[PDB]
Amino acid sequence: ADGAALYKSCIGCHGADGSKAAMGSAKPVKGQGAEELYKKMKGYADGSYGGERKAMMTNAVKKYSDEELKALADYMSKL
């Protein structure tokens, strides 16, 4: 939980809280809980989950190294 504050990079794909995915065709996985997101997001880096675009999420997990997602996306347990 921090989200928006370090989400400045990601706004164009999402809005503020996973609220779109816009890549082009991308899966707006929202209606979620932090734990599942963290697993999915770690999954993106380890090739254990993927998405249609999903290499930017791999880079995000890498550069916000793949504990900062608990700051970022572990928030989204609202939807």
Partner: protein, 59 residues
């Protein structure tokens, strides 16, 4: 030409990983560093649907 018809970003860093140093991975939270705006690299034609004004024309 990547005619970023006006530039805007709202982040995304998205199109860099499509056109790898054609946009280079400096996003300047309104800007992305479009190093090579000549290159109609068709991966960036996806990233029209991640510009907030859909503001990539190509030519």
């Amino acid at each position: 030409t990547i005619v970023i018809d006006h530039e805007e970003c709202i982040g995304c860093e998205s199109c860099v990983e499509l056109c790898p140093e054609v946009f280079a991975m400096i996003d300047g939270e309104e800007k992305a560093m479009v190093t090579a705006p000549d290159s109609t690299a068709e991966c960036a034609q996806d990233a029209i649907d991640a510009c907030p004004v859909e503001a990539i024309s190509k030519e």
